[PDB]
Amino acid sequence: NAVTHVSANSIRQHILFNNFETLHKDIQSKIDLVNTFTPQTKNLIFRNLLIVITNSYHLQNLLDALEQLEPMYVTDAYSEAILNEIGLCDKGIPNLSSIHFMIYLVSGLTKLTTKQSKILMEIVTDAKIFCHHVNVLEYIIKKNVEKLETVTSTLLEKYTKLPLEVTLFKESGLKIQGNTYIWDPEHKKSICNLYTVIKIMSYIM
């Protein structure tokens, strides 16, 4: 079941996201950027970010510090540690690639809802389950990202054997009951932002 869906809001989000290959190449370009970090840097960033996302206020100040190159704006020691690691600090030199990467990832995280941030904290404790969320969402996006339509469809039964916290997807506008979902292009930016965040996080965990 599909119906053409043209509003200004669906058009905007279709201009941003209409081609899975392009989206996936953009994500790969951020992941190869991660491959420039040492494992201790990746570890420090990943673990500190999981604490920062417990408080939207501190996460916003981290984003402002990154975007304005102004370490004075952070309001917590976990964000401060991130800035110290990438050189945005006294006696540091801010590393251009790392700043760009962190702006991208932190901006994506500020778009999550409180419930999504709480779920992310839960699912990161099991890498198989975390990756399963990534894989299921990737499949839905690959199937629907080119469509300027509201689509009702089902997941392959093979994608339903490991557990999911489907509220993670519902908070981005992907309605789900059982194995059936409704893809609405008015929520495409939220869904693709969520996928970009969890795809990238899976590579730093």
Numbering used by the authors: 13 to 217
Cite, word for word, the article reporting this structure.
Viruses acquire host genes via horizontal gene transfer and can express them to manipulate host biology during infections.
Our findings demonstrate the potential of structural homology screens to reveal genes that viruses capture from hosts and repurpose to benefit viral fitness.
